[PDB]
Structures are given as C-alpha cells and as structure tokens.
Amino acid sequence: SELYHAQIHLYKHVYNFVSSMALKSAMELGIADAIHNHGKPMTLSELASSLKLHPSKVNILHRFLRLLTHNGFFAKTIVKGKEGDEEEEIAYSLTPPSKLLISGKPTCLSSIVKGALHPSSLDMWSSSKKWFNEDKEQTLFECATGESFWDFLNKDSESSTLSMFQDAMASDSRMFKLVLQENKRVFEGLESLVDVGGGTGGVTKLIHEIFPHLKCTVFDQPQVVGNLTGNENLNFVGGDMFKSIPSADAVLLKWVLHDWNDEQSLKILKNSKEAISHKGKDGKVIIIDISIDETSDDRGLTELQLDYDLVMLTMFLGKERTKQEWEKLIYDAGFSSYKITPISGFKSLIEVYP
Amino acid sequence: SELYHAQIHLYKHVYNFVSSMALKSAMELGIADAIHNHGKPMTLSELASSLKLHPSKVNILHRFLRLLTHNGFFAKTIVKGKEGDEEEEIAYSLTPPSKLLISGKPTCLSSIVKGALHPSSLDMWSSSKKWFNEDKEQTLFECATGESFWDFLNKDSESSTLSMFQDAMASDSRMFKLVLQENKRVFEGLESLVDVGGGTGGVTKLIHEIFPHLKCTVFDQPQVVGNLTGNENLNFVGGDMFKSIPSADAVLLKWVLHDWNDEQSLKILKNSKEAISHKGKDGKVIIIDISIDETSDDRGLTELQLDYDLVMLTMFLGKERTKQEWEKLIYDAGFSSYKITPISGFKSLIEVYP
Ligand SMILES: Nc1ncnc2c1ncn2[C@@H]1O[C@H](CSCC[C@H](N)C(=O)O)[C@@H](O)[C@H]1O
Numbered sequence: 001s002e003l004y005h006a007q008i009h010l011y012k013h014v015y016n017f018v019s020s021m022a023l024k025s026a027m028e029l030g031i032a033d034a035i036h037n038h039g040k041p042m043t044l045s046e047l048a049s050s051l052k053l054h055p056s057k058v059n060i061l062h063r064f065l066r067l068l069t070h071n072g073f074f075a076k077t078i079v080k081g082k083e084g085d086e087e088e089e090i091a092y093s094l095t096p097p098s099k100l101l102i103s104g105k106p107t108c109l110s111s112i113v114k115g116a117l118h119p120s121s122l123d124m125w126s127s128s129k130k131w132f133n134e135d136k137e138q139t140l141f142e143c144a145t146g147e148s149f150w151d152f153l154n155k156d157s158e159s160s161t162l163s164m165f166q167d168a169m170a171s172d173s174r175m176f177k178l179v180l181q182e183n184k185r186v187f188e189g190l191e192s193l194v195d196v197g198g199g200t201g202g203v204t205k206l207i208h209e210i211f212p213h214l215k216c217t218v219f220d221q222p223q224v225v226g227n228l229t230g231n232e233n234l235n236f237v238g239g240d241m242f243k244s245i246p247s248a249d250a251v252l253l254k255w256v257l258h259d260w261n262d263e264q265s266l267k268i269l270k271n272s273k274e275a276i277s278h279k280g281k282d283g284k285v286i287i288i289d290i291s292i293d294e295t296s297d298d299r300g301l302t303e304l305q306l307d308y309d310l311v312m313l314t315m316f317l318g319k320e321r322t323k324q325e326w327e328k329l330i331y332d333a334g335f336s337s338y339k340i341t342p343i344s345g346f347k348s349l350i351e352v353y354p
Numbered sequence: 355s356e357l358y359h360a361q362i363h364l365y366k367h368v369y370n371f372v373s374s375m376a377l378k379s380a381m382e383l384g385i386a387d388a389i390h391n392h393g394k395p396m397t398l399s400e401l402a403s404s405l406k407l408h409p410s411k412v413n414i415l416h417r418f419l420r421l422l423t424h425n426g427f428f429a430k431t432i433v434k435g436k437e438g439d440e441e442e443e444i445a446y447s448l449t450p451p452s453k454l455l456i457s458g459k460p461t462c463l464s465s466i467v468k469g470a471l472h473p474s475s476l477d478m479w480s481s482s483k484k485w486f487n488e489d490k491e492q493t494l495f496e497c498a499t500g501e502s503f504w505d506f507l508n509k510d511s512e513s514s515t516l517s518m519f520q521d522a523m524a525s526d527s528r529m530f531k532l533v534l535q536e537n538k539r540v541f542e543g544l545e546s547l548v549d550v551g552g553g554t555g556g557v558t559k560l561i562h563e564i565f566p567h568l569k570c571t572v573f574d575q576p577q578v579v580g581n582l583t584g585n586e587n588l589n590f591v592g593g594d595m596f597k598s599i600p601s602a603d604a605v606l607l608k609w610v611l612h613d614w615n616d617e618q619s620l621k622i623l624k625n626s627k628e629a630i631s632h633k634g635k636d637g638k639v640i641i642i643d644i645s646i647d648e649t650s651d652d653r654g655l656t657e658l659q660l661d662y663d664l665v666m667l668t669m670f671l672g673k674e675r676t677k678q679e680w681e682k683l684i685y686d687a688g689f690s691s692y693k694i695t696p697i698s699g700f701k702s703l704i705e706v707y708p
Pocket residue numbers: 196197198199203219220221224239240241242253254255256
C-alpha cells in the first residue's frame with residue numbers, strides 16, 4: 001500500500017457537487033413530468049421529443065440520464081423497439097425519488113430543489129476564503145454580495161427570486177401535512193393542543209385537516225393574534241411564551257426553539273411542562289426541529305443534516321442542534337423521557353414526556 | 355409506508371454540494387498544513403490561532419471541522435487540556451485523505467482541488483437550462499460566458515486563473531510518477547517501450563526516473579519531435595501513428611485514445627498490436643485513460659467517474675469510455691485479453707494482450 005488509496009476518498013468529495021447539478025438539471029428540464037404524463041417507460045428519443053430538444057442536445061440528455069439512473073432517480077428497462085418492427089431500445093421509468101419531482105402533486109419538492117440549488121445560494125462560495133479571513137461578523141452571503149439574503153430578495157431587481165424562494169417555503173409548510181398523516185399516533189389520544197407561536201393559525205389549520213376533533217389553541221403575541229376568533233375547536237390567545245403557555249394536553253413547538261439560545265429555549269420548555277402539568281404523566285410536548293445524531297449508524301443522514309446546517313450557517317449564520325444538545329434541554333427542563341421520529345428526509349419530530 | 359421515504363434520498367443529492375464546498379474551504383484555509391507543521395493533534399484554539407482567525411470566525415471554523423471530521427478528513431482526539439491544569443479538550447488530526455492536502459509534498463492535490471472547485475468551473479451551471487433548450491452546439495461554459503474555456507484562460511484579465519489551472523495540470527502529470535511506483539510489475543520485464551504521442555519526452559523522463567534501464571522511444575509528429583536526440587536509452591522518432599508505430603516490447607498510449615473516436619482509436623490500437631508483433635505473446639499495449647465500470651460493486655467509484663465525465667461534457671463537450679466500450683475496441687483490434695488496474699482515485703491503467 002501507500003495510502004495513495006486516499007485519493008479515491010478525496011476525489012469523491014471534490015466532485016460530489018456534480019450530482020447536485022445533475023439533479024438540478026433533471027427538475028428544470030421537467031423530465032419527471034414528461035415521463036409521468038407519458039404514462040409508461042419512455043425512450044431517449046421519445047423523451048428528447050417531449051422536451052423538444054435540438055438534435056445536438058440529445059446526447060447531453062443521454063449523459064445526464066446515465067448519471068441520474070446510476071444515482072437512483074431512474075430505472076432502465078429494455079423495450080420492444082422503434083415500430084416498423086422492433087430493435088432493442090432503452091426506456092426510462094421514474095423511481096420513488098423522482099416521483100417527488102412530478103409537478104402539480106402535493107408531494108412535489110421541485111421548488112425546494114430549485115431554490116436550494118439557485119445561483120443566489122451557490123455563487124457566494126467564491127468568497128469563502130475572504131469570509132474566513134475578514135474581521136467582520138456576517139454571513140457568507142453578506143460577505144459576497146454586500147447585503148443580507150433578506151434584503152437581496154426584496155430588491156425590485158429580484159422579483160422572481162423572491163417569488164421562487166417564496167414557493168419553496170409554501171411547499172415546505174405544506175409537507176408538514178404529510179408529516180401529520182404519517183404520524184397520527186402522535187396526536188391520537190389528545191383532546192387539546194396548544195400551538196406555540198402559531199402565528200395566525202396556518203399550522204393549526206393543517207392539524208385541523210387531519211384531526212378535526214382536536215381542540216387547538218393558537219398561541220402567539222397579542223399583536224399577531226390581534227383579536228381573531230371562532231371555530232369552537234379553535235381559539236386564539238395572546239401572550240408571552242416566556243411568562244406562561246396556555247394549558248392543554250400537549251404543547252406543539254414547531255420551529256420555535258430553533259431561533260432561541262439554550263437559556264431562552266429552556267425557559268420555554270419549562271413553561272411547556274407547566275402547561276401540561278394538570279394532565280400529569282399523560283401530557284407531552286412536541287418539538288419539531290432538526291436533530292443531528294452524530295452517533296447514528298446512518299452516516300449519510302448525519303452528513304445531509306450537517307450539510308443543511310452548513311447552509312444555515314453560510315446564509316443566515318443560524319444553527320441546528322445535535323441530539324445531545326436536545327437531550328440536555330429536555331432533561332434540564334425536568335422531563336423524564338423523549339423519543340425522536342425522523343420526518344421529511346432529515347428533520348425530526350420529538351415527543352417529550354414529563 | 356408511503357414512499358415518503360424517498361425524501362431522504364432526494365435531499366442527500368440536493369445538498370451533496372455542501373460537502374465539496376467544505377473540502378474546498380479546508381484546503382484554501384491551509385488546515386492540513388497548519389496541523390502537519392504543528393507536528394501533533396491540534397486544538398480548535400491552537401488552530402484558530404495558527405490561521406490567525408478573527409475571534410468571530412472561530413465558531414465557523416468549528417462548524418466546518420465537525421462536518422469535515424464526519425466526512426473523514428480529520429479524526430477527533432481528547433487531550434489533556436489547556437495548561438494551567440487540564441479541562442478536557444478536542445484535538446484534530448490529519449487522516450490519509452487530508453494528508454493529500456499538505457503543500458510542498460509530491461502527493462499534494464491541493465491545486466487540482468482548487469481548480470476543480472473554482473468559480474470558473476462552477477458558476478456556469480446557472481445556464482444549464484438555457485443550455486439544454488438552445489439550438490447552438492457548444493459547451494455549458496461557452497453558453498454561459500460567450501467564449502470557450504481555453505479562450506477565457508488566455509485573457510489578460512485571467513492571468514492567475516490560467517496560472518492555477520496550469521498548476522493543476524503539472525500536479526496531475528506529476529502524479530503519474532506515483533502511478534509508476536505503485537505498479538512496477540507493469541514495466542518490469544520490458545526491455546523497450548514506445549511512448550505514442552509522447553510530445554517532447556516529458557512522460558518518458560518520468561518513466562526513466564523509475565526504470566532507468568528501459569529503452570524508451572518517444573514517438574510523435576515530425577514537427578513536435580523536431581530533431582531531438584540522445585540518452586542511449588532514449589530516442590525520438592517522428593511519424594504518423596495512423597500509419598505505423600515504432601516497434602518495441604510494449605506500446606504506451608497515455609491519454610491518446612481519449613481524443614479520438616472509435617474508428618480512429620481502433621486504427622491506432624491495430625498499429626499498436628503490430629509494433630509488438632515481433633515480441634509475440636510476450637508484448638503488451640498499455641492504455642492509460644478513464645474506464646467507467648457501471649457493473650462495478652463500488653457504486654461510489656462509478657459515480658465519481660460519471661461525475662468527472664459530466665465535467666468533461668459541460669466544460670469541453672468531451673467524453674470518457676465505459677469498460678464495455680474499451681472491451682469492444684480491444685477485442686475488435688484483435689487482442690486476446692486485458693486487465694484493468696485502478697489508478698489515481700478514479701483513472702485506469704489497462705494492460706492489453708495479443
Ligand atoms: N414571547 C412570545 N410568545 C409567543 N409567541 C412568540 C413570542 N415571541 C415571538 N413569538 C412568535 O414566535 C413565532 C416564531 S415563528 C413559529 C413558527 C410556526 N409555529 C410554524 O410552524 O411556522 C412568531 O409567530 C412570533 O410572533
């Protein structure tokens with residue numbers, strides 16, 4: 001040997017980005033939609049024809065397909081052959097991963113894919129070195145463009161970018177519904193639920209689509225909840241989560257602890273344990289946020305989570321918590337046990353028990 | 355289930371690019387060099403101090419380190435603790451993969467990493483959609499910048515880029531020496547070798563560094579070989595490989611068949627089988643080029659190879675061959691058997707037998 005075997009590992013990571021760009025191309029070309037609409041395995045020719053590609057772009061289409069098939073986004077099949085009796089020919093089929101790229105469906109993740117791999121998310125890396133060696137505390141995006149991501153989107157010049165980003169957020173909120181469908185046992189025995197920082201009731205409306213009989217109360221700041229009303233199984237309450245949280249069978253904390261440091265998060269968790277106190281060992285607190293498990297055997301899941309965490313760092317200077325950090329908060333808060341359920345690819349739903 | 359499990363696979367590929375940018379940052383920061391020069395596991399503090407980072411950049415350094423450690427470029431170790439008696443503290447060590455990033459060494463691949471992940475290699479992907487739907491046959495780089503990669507580098511404005519790219523090529527040629535050291539058995543029983551398209555003798559000089567007694571003849575076009583001379587175990591010969599190749603125990607074809615279509619490559623291989631004919635079943639032809647094995651069990655190696663192949667496509671519109679394609683040429687040429695030896699991460703050295 002010589003550990004000249006280390007090259008293989010070095011290069012896989014160097015060129016890993018190519019696979020992301022390939023997926024990106026697949027979605028922007030609408031391949032999934034083309035095949036799905038076709039209703040059956042599609043031939044290179046047929047597909048090229050559907051995409052209305054110029055003859056010279058057909059082999060490029062072939063190249064991307066081969067890489068994408070090897071990566072599991074398509075399955076090769078051999079079919080009869082171009083009519084005017086049969087030659088052997090390859091046909092492509094969608095696989096579960098690519099079915100996520102079919103537009104018009106509730107499961108479509110095309111937008112999140114488009115945004116995550118948009119130039120406004122990628123071009124900034126050319127300033128990574130300057131970013132490390134400067135004295136200004138800022139995001140990689142600010143260091144590279146001279147303005148925060150938020151400001152960039154709001155520029156008249158970036159009308160569409162702000163629109164696309166906006167689509168990804170809607171698509172991301174919508175997915176949470178699937179999260180509910182896939183984990184009913186989490187809300188089944190509950191009579192009531194308090195949605196902390198539930199804004200104007202968007203999330204609770206989704207909960208109400210799957211659990212119509214659940215009495216939910218949207219809790220937020222006085223000025224955000226205004227004086228909204230109704231829906232006997234839906235009520236709004238204004239207040240400060242750091243003072244107290246309305247009592248209920250369970251407390252929902254969806255994307256809240258992400259924005260607060262430990263000291264503030266601990267106080268919120270403590271108030272959450274109080275809101276369910278009356279229900280005793282029956283109550284629970286539900287935390288929906290990312291949980292990175294470094295000791296997990298699924299190394300690839302952890303890499304993906306850490307990758308997302310790095311995007312949060314370079315774009316917003318934000319952070320995600322590890323399983324240990326989460327454990328400290330939970331037990332420090334006074335809870336007895338907890339369970340983590342993976343959701344939406346790499347996110348987590350955490351059931352916390354007093 | 356629901357095949358909502360497909361999300362995990364979809365996202366891993368979406369965010370795969372993050373791992374490439376992280377490696378990129380590691381090399382530009384010179385982390386490997388910092389630790390290597392230190393001579394022993396290095397602490398976050400010590401490392402931050404070595405890189406002379408501003409206090410606010412230390413936690414970013416931490417973040418990148420965690421991801422890179424999980425990806426195998428560093429190994430965590432717990433050491434005594436900051437003097438003025440011990441607290442427990444983490445220390446980072448290089449691993450084989452990162453030792454490839456130590457500058458000044460013959461094994462350094464930093465340059466190839468820097469070039470492969472340079473803005474001039476990445477920014478062009480924002481034109482991937484326009485590229486697929488246009489009627490002009492060109493590379494993704496031409497479609498995005500309005501000029502070929504070659505022209506771009508030669509612009510006075512891109513002095514340094516052309517310099518960096520130039521460094522990666524030298525570094526890549528140099529690696530071939532390691533290839534020779536790691537595969538002596540390939541050239542051991544040879545008395546003579548003909549280096550087809552050996553230019554002015556650069557490659558043969560490397561061969562002469564490991565096998566000083568091997569009689570090598572650099573074969574190329576009359577105008578390139580001019581009238582070079584000497585070195586009793588080194589001679590130059592001008593000619594046309596499509597007409598004939600000087601006879602020798604073995605024919606070396608390093609990065610030649612890559613530039614020719616099958617028809618031209620087959621003719622070259624046939625002339626190669628003739629140049630070794632006199633040596634009988636003892637002779638051999640040595641092909642150094644990429645070989646993509648789709649049926650290989652090492653799926654990751656094939657992905658890397660296909661990834662590189664996609665870079666060759668979008669940058670130069672070039673292509674690499676699969677193992678089957680190579681097999682067709684070899685047997686079509688009239689050879690009996692062949693063997694493939696992986697080299698330099700994802701390249702191949704192919705021994706062909708008459
Ligand atoms: N002291 C406080 N008490 C209750 N809500 C608060 C608060 N301070 C901020 N908020 C609310 O915190 C929310 C954070 S956004 C919460 C996300 C939401 N549950 C979702 O699923 O998308 C905002 O709606 C904000 O108005």
